[PDB]
Amino acid sequence: EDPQLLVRVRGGQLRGIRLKAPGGPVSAFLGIPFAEPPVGSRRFMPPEPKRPWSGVLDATTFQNVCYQYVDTLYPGFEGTEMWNPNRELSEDCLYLNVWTPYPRPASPTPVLIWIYGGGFYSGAASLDVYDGRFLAQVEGAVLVSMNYRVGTFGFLALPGSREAPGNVGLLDQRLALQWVQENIAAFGGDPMSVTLFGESAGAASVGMHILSLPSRSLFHRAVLQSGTPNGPWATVSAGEARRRATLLARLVGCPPGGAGGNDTELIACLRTRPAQDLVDHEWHVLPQESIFRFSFVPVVDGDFLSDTPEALINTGDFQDLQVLVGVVKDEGSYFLVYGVPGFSKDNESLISRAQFLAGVRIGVPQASDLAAEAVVLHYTDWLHPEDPTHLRDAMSAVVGDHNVVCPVAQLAGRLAAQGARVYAYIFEHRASTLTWPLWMGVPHGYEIEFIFGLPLDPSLNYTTEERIFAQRLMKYWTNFARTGDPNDPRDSKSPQWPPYTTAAQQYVSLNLKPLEVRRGLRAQTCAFWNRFLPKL
Amino acid sequence: EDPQLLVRVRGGQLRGIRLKAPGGPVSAFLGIPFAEPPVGSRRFMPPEPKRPWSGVLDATTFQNVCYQYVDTLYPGFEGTEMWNPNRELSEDCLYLNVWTPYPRPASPTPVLIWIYGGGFYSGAASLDVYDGRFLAQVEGAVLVSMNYRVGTFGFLALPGSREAPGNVGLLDQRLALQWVQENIAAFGGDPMSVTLFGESAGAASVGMHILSLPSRSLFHRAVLQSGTPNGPWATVSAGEARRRATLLARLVGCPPGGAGGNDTELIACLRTRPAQDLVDHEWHVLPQESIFRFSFVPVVDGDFLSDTPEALINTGDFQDLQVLVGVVKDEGSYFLVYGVPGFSKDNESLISRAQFLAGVRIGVPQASDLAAEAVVLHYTDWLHPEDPTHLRDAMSAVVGDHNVVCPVAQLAGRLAAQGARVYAYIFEHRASTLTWPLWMGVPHGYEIEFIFGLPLDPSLNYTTEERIFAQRLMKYWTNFARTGDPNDPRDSKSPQWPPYTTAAQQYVSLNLKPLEVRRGLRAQTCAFWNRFLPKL
């Protein structure tokens, strides 16, 4: 009976498990419920705090994954399957995980809260790439990661109705943050130093906790990796969420008996449908044929988001905020194989000019004819307009800039203009273990392995250079979470990382070579996306 | 008494003058009338062939300059004054000049016909930069240059009328070309090798002789230097020419007193106006505040131009044609000091961003609001949007690319696609003797000094390197006129000047350094001007 693995929180006693990290033991508490299961008549509704329990509740193991669509495109392929659920799917998914050094730290340790991505349609904190034993052991951090509801279950909304108010997955996240506030001191964490960091939709979620006043008192510093609250895919209007919800209900046969305009009857009918009945029709409600669009995402309800994210970042007061943002080299690459015809992971995806034009219509689905013409003009090389290599790479660049890079640049420019301290990176290193094809470069979400320190595991067959690289990145992130600055205090000789500013526009490259400072994150192109195309 | 200077043409006998070129004598016949003077009742009317004369006509001096505006902006400044009329101004201007070697050539010599520029409001063949003695002495060419009516006197049009059909300055040029066809064998020229070459409006004129079918039997090869028949400034619609002509008539106090109506009466009244009255009022009729816009230019009458120049170059068959086209480094440089505020030749001309926006509204005067926004987007550097130097150069680039470079790129592309043999250049060398300020670079029309071989004159204080440069350029031009190819027929690894094609898009740089082959003349930017921008 180990006294370090027995911890009492508000709700009751917890039993953890001692895990072996490469450099020493860590304490893990996995599957701590922070909310009553959102099942039955709780579906689509905001979460309620987990009722206290009796005896010792077992957290030695990851709990179930929130119910979600599962990626079937390339069965058996490590590239997709690494992101697929590694546990049972259930609507009783609201649980969080805690990693602490062994033993508990003598003094309160800054806390890191990871919010996973997946486009608000998928993901779990039990995935191997989110393993927090390396950060906890090496940098002494207390790392928390929670499961939140995704897809319809988290985001199906009938705006204005009480039964399906929308954004309840964000409310799951917020409840996990309040749980960290109340209970994290018992694990050795400091509730007064709390850094949220996330990738893809998780990153967007982080931004939204910045823009929602009730969430601002639950965290101090924030990191957005390859995602933003603003931009094309991360939010939907009230009317659009009503359209998608009503259409999905229509596909599952809801409501019955003469239909009507009763919202309580529609959501009452939906709450009796098996989860998979909803997931079956999840993708059918997208308004246009598209990639990098997700059916059920945060809605602008005038509640959790008091206004649109763009308006909130434009007019906000960010004076006391410290943000770290960045992108990867090719953000849009693998999205192309998800239904832009001519693109596959098993060949070079050399495409014709017509295939590139159609690809623009899919990858920028909300673009008008004139806006698509502008995108084609901008991304075409008119010395080699037919060159299939440049057409393919330029398609990847269109998707990546549109959905990620340019929204990140917009967010960093706005936050820096409004008084925030912003740090910007671009992750250029392709993992030696990557199973995706060569032409896709560094794809969406492939920096996460190194931030969490997976290369420090020698059994994972990384390179030694990737091990020291991962250690350096863990130093950057942990330094940021601790001091609000990624640079190592005192030090120097280790070229400094300047803050991103409006005048200088300085960002750094994260790769095997030492830190290289650059100016102008896709400056001309993102001026086109962020400035011109709106006028069209 | 000189046996070489007495020459008989179809109209009568003429006696020329022996001139001293730096390396030997040449024969000059200057002021040969090719047309009955377009004076009195013949104003605005097409030219009539010069009726035969008695005696020996004096060829030894330049004749009058066509009545035209005189540049007052910078009095005493060589930069502007070198283009001003150097002879008496008169409405009886129609005369041409012939240069041949001394003695006159034994066997028929390929003929070069120069059509001067000046935006169809100005110019003359008597200017020092158009002096043909160097091409006659050094390269043995027979060079002809003619005066044609400019301004109201050649281009004022009431389309469809008998009394002022429009384009009579172009008909002046054509009549000179027909005269050359009949009479040039008397001077030793070869009527079956005739190369038109011109600059600015002259270049445009050349292009229109290509697109006008009656002019097609008077020449073989063409050279267009910094001008095109297509594009914003070189043509006006029938209705616009009628609008400008009627407005001018009313401004000179010539309705007479009701409005308008009978075109015989409007033109009859307009013919009673002093020449300087017309010149005084000619700039009043420009529809918007603008630079690089000229009031009276060729009109699309459905007669000389069967269709718009863009239409004719898109649908034409050029299969037997040989064209040489090119631009200079900064085309729009000195247009900016003509009333874009903030631009003068006496300072570094560093401008603010607001001055750049207004400057785009002036330099692209027919652009809509959205089109101007697009121009400002494209030409702004978004790493240094406020940098005054980049904004000044960018303003120059807007005017240059809009009026010259991109029209040349469209013409080159269309002629190449439809089967012409196209050679393309970019003139990068700034004359050491240039009086315009440093920031203007190589301005509009400053390659002509070198093409005509003026640096071979030692009194003009050029460099030796510019002597060699001028010689090399004269060899390219006369090689093209002779063979339809600029390249030295007997040579290898000079290197070679390749023909412009749609696939390769190869052009050469003309400067002090040896020929450098480049691809993609203003490829992306002119893709913006020619392809996208129209759709707004």
Ligand SMILES: CC[N+](CC)(CCCCCn1c(C)cc(=O)n(CCCCC[N+](CC)(CC)Cc2ccccc2[N+](=O)[O-])c1=O)Cc1ccccc1[N+](=O)[O-]
């Ligand atoms: C008293 C002056 N007014 C009344 C008659 C007229 C003002 C003169 C016109 C000013 N202007 C404008 C407004 C636009 C424009 O594009 N240009 C052409 C100038 C380009 C350069 C001129 N040159 C030297 C002579 C080059 C150095 C000639 C040249 C040489 C070789 C190739 C090509 C050229 N070229 O193309 O010109 C221009 O001159 C006053 C008045 C009255 C009513 C309305 C407006 C005015 N005003 O605006 O001044």
Ligand SMILES: *[C@@H]1O[C@H](CO)[C@@H](O)[C@H](O)[C@H]1NC(C)=O
């Ligand atoms: C919706 O249905 C419930 C139960 O059938 C009913 O009590 C309620 O009045 C209905 N709402 C409306 C607006 O008809």
Ligand SMILES: *[C@@H]1O[C@H](CO)[C@@H](O)[C@H](O)[C@H]1NC(C)=O
């Ligand atoms: C690559 O594979 C995809 C799917 O198998 C196919 O649609 C595409 O035509 C292929 N591309 C090439 C260049 O063979």
Ligand SMILES: *[C@@H]1O[C@H](CO)[C@@H](O)[C@H](O)[C@H]1NC(C)=O
């Ligand atoms: C123009 O005016 C004259 C006046 O002598 C008149 O005879 C003639 O018919 C008029 N032309 C037209 C087309 O009306």
Ligand SMILES: [Cl-]
């Ligand atoms: Cl283990």
Ligand SMILES: [Cl-]
């Ligand atoms: Cl269980």
Ligand SMILES: [Cl-]
């Ligand atoms: Cl949006």
Ligand SMILES: [Cl-]
């Ligand atoms: Cl196209």
Ligand SMILES: [Cl-]
């Ligand atoms: Cl769009």
Ligand SMILES: [Cl-]
């Ligand atoms: Cl690009």
Ligand SMILES: [Cl-]
């Ligand atoms: Cl008369």
Ligand SMILES: [Cl-]
């Ligand atoms: Cl002869």
Ligand SMILES: [Cl-]
């Ligand atoms: Cl036009």
Ligand SMILES: [Cl-]
């Ligand atoms: Cl019109």
Ligand SMILES: [Cl-]
């Ligand atoms: Cl601006």
Ligand SMILES: [Cl-]
């Ligand atoms: Cl653009």
